[PDB]
Design a binder for this molecule. Structure first.
Ligand SMILES: Nc1nc2c(ncn2[C@@H]2O[C@H](COP(=O)(O)OP(=O)(O)OP(O)(O)=S)[C@@H](O)[C@H]2O)c(=O)[nH]1
Ligand SMILES: [Cl-]
Ligand SMILES: [Mg+2]
Length: 343
């Protein structure tokens, strides 16, 4: 007879921007209380910063593209849009938390309509233009409103690179989960190893939509290749001999749009992909091909004294509250059933 308390450690791992914190926020929303008014307002400075960050990357990329174009007026901005442009890049560089006003939103919304910016957005995958860009650019009136209060959707979009280690505790529906969120950019990974003891499950986030993108850390490195190599590295860690692996193939909502426009074949790993249909048939073909690449990667890298550990794959969109709820229930049943097996 002991205390009766069973705390199981769960670890979010994955590359920078893969969706870990987003999953983390969903867990708090599902298994604890919903964000109260003060908590919602605390994200305004982040959301506003994101808007200036996004327009800056577009404004800078246009300058990059114009220098390499020698016989085109393609990436030359208007005069008004330059008067707006330069103003914003000044503000966003001297302030970590630039405020989005009615007037600033007007300039951005005007700068967004410039064909030079649009020509830049079209080549966004060659830049670090975030996926949420269209969303932000379409909600400026709401976001710049004097009494702006962020929605759950806003907060989940809100993007901060994680630089510390945060823990939450929850029991689904004396069994408790202790869930850790940590940064996944290369420099933050130095923090990983000290978290690796006594882990019941690793929840590894793989952003499957990034197959035509390059890293923040190294703009020459394909993002999907990094995820491949990173997952590979996690799987070989001695501490994880008995740890369950829950693989979230995340950003499926983005992957769905992208695959019918950008062939999987642009990523080295997916070089031999052959399309077979159109529409939803093709999307599912492409998904199953990616999933199979990850499965094979898993078995290729799991040695015999580890092959018995649990391994599951889930297709996720971290912004989708109902899907994360249903995904987490499956994960919990699997972990419970397994712990009950080794008893
Ligand atoms: N469309 C879409 N966007 C997503 C999805 N998952 C995460 N995002 C968005 O991607 C961005 C990065 O997500 P985030 O949760 O911060 O990644 P991270 O793994 O925590 O990144 P880091 O801390 O290691 S730098 C956020 O703006 C978030 O809203 C998704 O499934 N679909
Ligand atoms: Cl099972
Ligand atoms: Mg994070």
């Amino acid at each position: 007879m002991g205390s009766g308390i069973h705390i199981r450690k769960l670890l979010l791992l994955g590359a920078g921007e893969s969706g870990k914190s987003t999953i983390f926020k969903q867990i708090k929303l599902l298994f604890q209380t919903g964000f109260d008014e003060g908590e919602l307002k605390s994200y305004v400075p982040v959301i506003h910063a994101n808007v200036y960050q996004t327009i800056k990357l577009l404004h800078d990329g246009t300058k990059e593209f114009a220098q390499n174009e020698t016989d085109s007026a393609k990436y030359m901005l208007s005069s008004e849009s330059i008067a707006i442009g330069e103003k914003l890049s000044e503000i966003g560089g001297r302030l970590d938390y630039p405020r989005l006003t009615k007037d600033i939103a007007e300039g951005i919304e005007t700068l967004w309509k410039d064909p030079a910016i649009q020509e830049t957005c079209a080549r966004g995958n060659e830049l670090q233009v975030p996926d949420c860009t269209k969303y932000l650019m379409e909600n400026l009136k709401r976001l710049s409103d004097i009494n702006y209060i962020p929605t759950k959707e806003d907060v989940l979009y809100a993007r901060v690179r994680t630089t510390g280690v945060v823990e939450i505790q929850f029991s689904p529906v004396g069994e408790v989960y202790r869930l850790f969120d940590v940064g996944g950019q290369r420099n933050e990974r130095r923090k990983w190893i000290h978290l690796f003891e006594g882990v019941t499950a690793v929840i590894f986030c793989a952003a499957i939509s990034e197959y035509d993108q390059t890293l923040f850390e190294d703009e020459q490195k394909n993002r999907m290749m990094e995820t491949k190599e990173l997952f590979d590295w996690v799987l070989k860690q001695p501490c994880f001999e008995k740890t369950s692996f829950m693989l979230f193939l995340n950003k499926f909502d983005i992957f769905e749009k992208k695959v019918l426009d950008v062939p999987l074949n642009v990523c080295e790993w997916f070089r031999d992909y052959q399309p077979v249909s159109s529409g939803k048939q093709e999307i599912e073909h492409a998904y199953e091909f990616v999933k199979k690449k990850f499965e094979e990667l898993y078995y290729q890298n799991t040695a015999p004294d580890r092959v018995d550990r649990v391994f599951k794959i889930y297709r996720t969109t971290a912004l989708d509250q109902k899907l994360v709820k249903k995904t987490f229930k499956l994960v919990d049943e699997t972990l419970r059933r397994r712990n009950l097996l080794e008893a």
